[PDB]
Amino acid sequence: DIVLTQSPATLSVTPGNSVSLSCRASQSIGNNLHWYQQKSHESPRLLIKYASQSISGIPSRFSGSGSGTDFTLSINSVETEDFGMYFCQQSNSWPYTFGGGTKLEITDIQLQESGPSLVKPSQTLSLTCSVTGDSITSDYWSWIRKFPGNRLEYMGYVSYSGSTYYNPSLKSRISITRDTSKNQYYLDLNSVTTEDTATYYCANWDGDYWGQGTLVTVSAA
Amino acid sequence: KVFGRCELAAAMKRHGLDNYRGYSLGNWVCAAKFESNFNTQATNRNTDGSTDYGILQINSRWWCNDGRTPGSRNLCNIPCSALLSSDITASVNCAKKIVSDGNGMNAWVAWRNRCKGTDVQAWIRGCRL
């Protein structure tokens, strides 16, 4: 898998300063690098797509550059709202992968996840994502999870043809399906272990729309 | 905008299409040629009322909205005129999405008939990259 090393790991900063965050990739990935901001468990927000392209509704001050294996997110003149984690993600190769994060300390269509919040080891976790505002036949749909130590993992997606892509680390325990007439899509995760405790998010493939996320604990009791 | 082969090759490389999801760069250059003939502004109307737009001839029944096409699905979430620009940006972004489905490049009829199985890397011989 393409591995993305982010640095620095943490950064403190005064409003008005300019900053640069760095993402380096274990192999050449073209322009296929995107940046998210996430404030202590909320859906991540996409800021720059494809290394340097603007996103509608994102403030001017955010910009990016680079290609190949060196990528830079720049915050020209920081505001206090800019605090939180920042993540790079590649989309060049499957599985998609996320950098380790950089903590920045300062000095229409809706999606909803449903499912259990407590599950026994060894059981099947089932999640539902209810989509509102358009047909699920009008996009591709993903599941992502955020582990307790901040780590982000792309689990998979289903695309217009009904074909599916799954992250190989889930070794065939995962399933993704659609029910068109209900406007839902589903995650199934078989044989859970305590490793699978995380926040689960549904999202469209674009990374524009995310559900709120939902905490699922796997616990011997 | 009408492109030179080598000028498109470099643009597409700049836009991250060398080795995108298992496809080498000559695949995209070959397809552009047989789809639109390197013209960002090509439009072709179909029997079913859909139209193909741009250098990759992207169809309005599935991928974009032109406000003309019956049961359009707008998978790329983009109006079809974005696909016309002298900039190849929108067209690349949408083609990346198309190719991320299991069908991959088999979506393009011209590619299946003209590029698939051939020595596609030929299409990038000559240029400084």
Which residue from B21, B62, B75 is facing A93, i.e. has the nearest CB? B21
How deeply is A93 buried, as exposed, middle or buried, from its count of CB atoms within 10 A (0-12, 13-18, 19+)?
middle
Q: Which two tokens stand for residue B86?
A: 């002298």
Residues 6+ apart with CB under 8 A from A172: A166
Residues β-bridged to residue A214: A200
Residues 6+ apart with CB under 8 A from A55: A46, A47, A48, A49
CATH number among 2.40.50.140, 2.60.40.10, 2.40.50.220, 2.60.120.200, domain A1-110: 2.60.40.10
Whole-number Å distance between alpha carbons of A212 and A42 = 6
Closest CA to A47 of A37, A39, A38, A33: A37
Calculate ∠ Cα B75-B80-B83, nearest 5°.
100
Calculate ∠ Cα A146-A149-A151, nearest 5°.
45
CB of A143 within 8 A of CB of A155? yes
Closest CA to B91 of B110, B78, B104, B103: B78
Homologous superfamily of A111-210: Immunoglobulins (2.60.40.10)
Chain A contact for B97 (CB, 8 A cutoff): yes
Q: Strand (E) positions, chain A?
A: 4-7, 10-13, 19-25, 33-38, 45-48, 62-67, 70-75, 84-90, 97-98, 102-106, 110-114, 118-119, 125-132, 141-146, 152-158, 164-166, 174-179, 184-189, 198-204, 214-218
CB of A147 within 8 A of CB of A169? no
Are residues A92 and B103, on separate chains, in Cβ contact within 8 Å? no
For B66, other C-beta atoms within 10 Å of its C-beta total 19
Sign, Cα dihedral of A79, A82, A84, A87: negative
Whole-number Å distance between alpha carbons of B105 and B30 = 12
Q: Which two tokens stand for residue A156?
A: 């998979």
Ranges in chain A annotated CATH 2.60.40.10? 1-110, 111-210
Q: Strand (E) positions, chain B?
A: 43-45, 51-53, 58-59
Sign, Cα dihedral of A26, A151, A88, B16: positive
B101 is an annotated ligand-binding site residue: yes
Q: Which two tokens stand for residue A26?
A: 């274990």
Substitution target from A27, A32, A97, A204 for chain B, most B beta carbons within 10 A: A32
Half-sphere exposure of A159 (CA within 13 A, CB side): 20
Closest CA to A67 of B63, B15, B85: B15
Q: Which residue has the tokens 């020209």?
A: A76
Count of residues making up chain A = 221
Q: Which residues of B touch A203 (CB under 8 A)?
A: none
Rg (CA), chain A: 18
Half-sphere exposure of B105 (CA within 13 A, CB side): 26
Q: Which residues of B touch A54 (CB under 8 A)?
A: none
Helix (H/G/I), strand (E/B), else coil: A45: strand
For B102, other C-beta atoms within 10 Å of its C-beta total 13
Closest chain A CA to residue B99: A159
Sign, Cα dihedral of B80, B86, B89, B92: positive
Contacts A–B by Cβ distance under 8 A = 57
* Burial letters A30-67, b for 16+ CB under 10 A, else e: bbbbbbbbbeeeebbbbbbbbbbeebeebeeebbbebb
Domain ranges of chain B: 1-129
Calculate ∠ Cα A70-A72-A78, nearest 5°.
165
Closest CA to A78 of A62, A102, A92, A64: A62
Chain B contact for A56 (CB, 8 A cutoff): no
Q: Which residues of A touch B100 (CB under 8 A)?
A: 140, 159, 205
Chain A contact for B68 (CB, 8 A cutoff): no
Whole-number Å distance between alpha carbons of A199 and A144 = 8
- The two beta strands, A110-114 and A164-166, are unpaired
Tell me how close the Cα of B74 comes to any Cα of chain A, in angstroms.
6
Are residues B100 and A205, on separate chains, in Cβ contact within 8 Å? yes
Residues 6+ apart with CB under 8 A from B96: A91, B17, B20, B21
Backbone angles phi, psi at A84, to 5 degrees: 135, -170
Whole-number Å distance between alpha carbons of B112 and B104 = 11
Which residue from B15, B20, B75 is facing A92, i.e. has the nearest CB? B20
CATH number among 1.10.30.50, 1.10.530.10, 1.10.10.10, 2.40.50.140, domain B1-129: 1.10.530.10
Closest chain A CA to residue B12: A30
Whole-number Å distance between alpha carbons of A147 and A215 = 10
Residues 6+ apart with CB under 8 A from A140: A157, A158, A159, A160, A204, A205, B75, B97, B100, B101
Are residues A160 and B101, on separate chains, in Cβ contact within 8 Å? yes
Whole-number Å distance between alpha carbons of B21 and A32 = 10
Chain B contact for A198 (CB, 8 A cutoff): no
For B70, other C-beta atoms within 10 Å of its C-beta total 9
Sign, Cα dihedral of A135, A55, A36, B18: positive
Positions of B marked active-site: 35, 52
CB of B109 within 8 A of CB of B35? no
Residues 6+ apart with CB under 8 A from A105: A10, A11, A12, A13, A83
CB of A74 within 8 A of CB of A65? yes
Amino acid at A94: W
Rg (CA), chain B: 14
Helices B25-36 and B5-14 sit at what angle, rounded to 10 degrees? 130
Element (H, E) at B47: none
Residue A15: C-alpha distances to residues A40, A76, A79, A100 (Å): 20, 10, 5, 24
Contacts 24+ apart (CB under 8 A), B69-73: B73/A135, B73/A137, B73/A138, B73/A160
Amino acid at A176: I
Chain A contact for B17 (CB, 8 A cutoff): yes
CA B69 to mean position of chain CA atoms: 20
Q: Which two tokens stand for residue A174?
A: 């995962």
